[PDB]
């Protein structure tokens, strides 16, 4: 199928800063991929990125007390919104399922491949570090990055290529917010 | 928890 | 920065397709089916806690699908350019044998928002136990979808995630089986 498609794309964001001490609203509107109007809460008016939203732009500017109302979004919108469920997003907490295995097992004479895998944990922010004899592998370290499976919460996977000896012992360590003390398995020759 | 607000989409021909 | 609620909506033409949907830091807190009419949580949860009358929403799908035609015209009707997605297929969680377990085919960076997703177990179509997420909005404005199929890791199968959409040639595949 070929014929011609003509996508409209419209987004209210408010971005929060330190709770809600310092909010910001904005209004894209976008065409097709390219925004050309839009409006910034620390503007006050409507702004037209391209020509394409020309028009529109001087039309709400001159009203004047529109113009201001969308400023009090950043109350009667943002941070109201914002409580109306804080209670199960910016306190969601789901404690990481953390699992440590090595790919190739024979391999335990050469190089070989530890994985520390993360998974369902749910504020974005965590931390992995790689403990070989509790001491920081500092480097010779491989991540996943951040992995959004889509369902509220995510999944990552720090590894770490060492030539396994039969006495060190290898530690992974995982802090999340979501478990008072640091979350920790260990794994040796 | 509560209800939430939508800002309303407002069109201009011209 | 620490947060952003984003509320996302899109009207397409000619497919005459839409959407409403709230976001939370990158994840979905609920949407409206245009269809059905009512509005759905992504997680039961949410929606014990909160409200919206899913009514509103689709007063602005329709004020969206007019400012379209208008922004339609005014540019002399250019098309949007079709962006071809980017197919990954994880595994939830770390897969053992015989232990439950769920397949997501993770379609991202595309645009127009369109595209249709099958999963095959050996080649062969599966629609059961499967389910997916309307489509996610990106800060450069393209889109992000998941597909889920909840399976039971075997030695013996395989696995395939197909996907098409118009700005790929021929379909997309996305393999994987137990053991690399
Ligand atoms: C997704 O939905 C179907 C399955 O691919 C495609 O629609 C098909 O059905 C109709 C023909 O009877 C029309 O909608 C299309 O002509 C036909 N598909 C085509 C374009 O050949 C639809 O196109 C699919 N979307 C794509 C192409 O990714
Ligand atoms: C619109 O685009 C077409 C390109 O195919 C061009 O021929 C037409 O003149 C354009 N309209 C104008 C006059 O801007």
């Known amino acids: 199928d070929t014929r011609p498609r003509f996508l409209q794309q419209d987004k209210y964001e408010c971005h929060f800063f330190n709770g809600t001490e310092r909010v910001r609203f904005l209004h894209r509107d976008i065409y097709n991929q390219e925004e050309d109007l839009r409006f910034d809460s620390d503007v006050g008016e409507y702004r037209a990125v391209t020509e394409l939203g020309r028009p529109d732009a001087e039309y709400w500017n001159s009203q ?10 950043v109350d009667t919108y943002c941070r109201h919104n914002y409580g109306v469920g804080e209670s199960f997003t910016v306190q969601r907490r789901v404690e990481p399922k953390v699992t440590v295995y090595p790919a190739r097992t024979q391999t335990l004479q050469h190089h070989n491949l530890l994985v520390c895998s993360v998974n369902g944990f749910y504020p974005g922010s965590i931390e992995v570090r790689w403990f070989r004899n509790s001491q920081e592998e500092k ?10 499976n889509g369902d509220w919460t995510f999944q990552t996977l720090v590894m770490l290529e060492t030539v396994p000896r039969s006495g060190e012992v290898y530690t992974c360590q995982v802090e999340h917010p979501s478990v008072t003390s640091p979350l920790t398995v260990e794994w040796r020759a | 928890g509560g209800v939430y607000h939508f800002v309303k989409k407002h069109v201009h021909e011209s | 920065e620490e947060h952003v609620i984003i509320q996302a909506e899109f009207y397409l033409n000619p497919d005459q397709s839409g959407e409403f949907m709230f976001d939370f830091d990158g994840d979905e807190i609920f949407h409206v089916d245009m269809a059905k009419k009512e509005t759905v949580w992504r997680l039961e949860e949410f929606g014990r806690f909160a409200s919206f009358e899913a009514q509103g929403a689709l007063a ?13 015209k005014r540019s002399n009707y250019t098309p949007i350019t079709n962006v071809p997605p980017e ?22 960076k595309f645009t127009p928002p369109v595209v249709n997703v099958t999963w095959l177990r050996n080649g062969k179509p599966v629609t059961t136990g499967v389910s997916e997420t309307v489509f996610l909005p990106r800060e450069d404005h393209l889109f992000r979808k998941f597909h889920y199929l909840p399976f039971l890791p075997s030695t013996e199968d395989v696995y395939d995630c197909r996907v098409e959409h118009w700005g790929l040639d ?11």
Do not use: Y
């Open chain 3, 60 to 72: 602005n799908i329709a004020v969206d699908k007019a400012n379209l035609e208008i922004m339609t």
């Open chain 1, 139 to 148: 480097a010779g370290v491989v991540s996943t990055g951040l992995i959004q």
């Open chain 3, 87 to 108: 197919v990954t297929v994880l595994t939830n969680s770390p897969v053992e044998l015989r232990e439950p377990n769920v397949l997501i085919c993770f379609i991202d």
């Open chain 3, 170 to 180: 021929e379909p997309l595949l996305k393999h994987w089986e137990f053991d690399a």
């Open chain 1, 64 to 73: 004047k007390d529109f113009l201001e109302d969308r400023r009090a979004a």
